[PDB]
Amino acid sequence: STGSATTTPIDSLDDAYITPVQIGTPAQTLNLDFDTGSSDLWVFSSETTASEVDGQTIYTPSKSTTAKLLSGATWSISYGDGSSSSGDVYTDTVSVGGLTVTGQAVESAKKVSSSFTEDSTIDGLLGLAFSTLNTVSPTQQKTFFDNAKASLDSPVFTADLGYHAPGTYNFGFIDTTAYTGSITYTAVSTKQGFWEWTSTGYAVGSGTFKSTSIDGIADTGTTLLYLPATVVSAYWAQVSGAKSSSSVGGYVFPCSATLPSFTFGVGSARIVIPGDYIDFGPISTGSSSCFGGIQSSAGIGINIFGDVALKAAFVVFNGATTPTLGFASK
Template identity: 55%
Template structure:
């Protein structure tokens, strides 16, 4: 049996179950309830059959995103914009000050605030390999994770933001106006022999700050880490908001939520994951995001070296198009025996949102245990002294308790509007979800967990990371 050019140790950990093994283990009709999860142990994942090549996409360093200024308020505004929540005048003023410090000019700015710094997003097949792996690359303070995606024939490599909170694959292209480009790698439509326009199809995404991106649609070959889909809908940007123009490191976005929220009209298109699903060795992908270093997404297999203990599965509610689930409550502190306080809430697992955004009751209870914490109008959210030793936050997801280390909640310097200044105040990675339709378990949470997105059973799986990571 031949494997790709990995070390034998890593290859041995990439698992593909025999036909029906995982499905039998977590059969939907016998699956977890809202309060009791199904536990999948490593012993259930013994190798039966390797379903094809195992491919590891090399990590890529993004040197174009090095600015620390205003990371916290920008991440907060990004979440609001993504889900259509009005951005407060106070936060708009903060953003305008940040943009001014960054030297970013916003057309039409009148001095009442700008939202161009929000980074608001979101926004047939053959499989050359049944397994694939793609490295996620963090930008400073993990605000955005990018990964290599190949589009067209011959392949053109673009760096895209993988987003489990949206369902569009859209890119900067040769159709994007020159005035709206800023060094992004472009999808050259004419250079791809397999590109064909989807006649009559258009897309348009409007963000919470009133800006929008839009364009037309092509069908082309798309590959991620060796998994290839033909006739994948690729949305070509004929217009992009200035927030995307200013993000020079990213050439677009690849959505991994449900097909139902795809924005192509008149007929919504399938996501890359949905198109590839039937040909994957296992109908799932996993996210292993990390703090201040590259993580990875695996498609079609589970790597047992990336988690400890068992994977705890809970049913996902996909009716609204997201990887939505119910969380039961929380605990604050570093004790493993801390009692869970009941605060039931609906949440989504969203790699496209940087922060962890929870009900106000949880956020207030957490920061009540942080002596220097305060809700700051000046900075747009909760801040605290950078040298504060933050407690852990435990979130109860069914019968599984997910622990978010306090170190992850120290997100970024806050008092850094001047790029040459020093910081003593830090912005919290945990903020309130007030105004949002659900809590958002974004990257601050996801970096603490190994997460399985099971498309076959519409389930989410969570497991602790190895203590050495």
């Protein structure tokens, strides 16, 4: 089997991407944030505290003839931006882009933090990291991809995120028309539950490539590119007027600037992030200070190749017995 679904930015800055997902019988379609950095499929639901729902589409298990309470199971998750959610669990039929999994754990939110409430466009998350991170207790549950894997034509999914445009998530096949040149594959460590890999270095603009190992994760659920302070300083030093602002919470730059590109290494291959991808616009409406898309990972504890990086590439998440990651230009 295979599946193919379009993923669409939630706003004009590509702050996140939503992908329609069919849950239950008859189908209830929710727009979920596919997140290769976590491993819970959770949704706004008929159980979510009413004051914490503000425009989201909700899953109502009592209206699904295939929904079953997973008795005794609960979940609770916190993310790197300090957001959180928690609740109980149903199993139900879940389809993405024509690919159907029966008996998928669908985690129903009883509580969500303010940032989720405040984002009316995201109806929940669909985790695509390794199932070892799944938070369901006392019986840990599998991700949609893990459940689907054995039925897929090939045990892979691909992320093809657009810059200010829709893109695609494919399951079970590699669309050889969706990228240019060849795909360079690189080793993955699953020790922390992530799609963790090591970039071979970076360049800023037309500058020389610096060979250096940068361990990080391929995370579709994180907006920006978070890298070591040394690397980030070298990038922003090429932008007149750019500075790190503790009050804003990162690097900002004059909105009048033309940003240089940023290149990262994948083995001997190179992925180029155009400068425009690194512009996240005014820090507040009408401001002439703009927020940077490359930020320091110091104090996160991990480097994160988020959407800013991933959207510059066609990315293969290879879930074979020894997982790997592939990157191609596009």
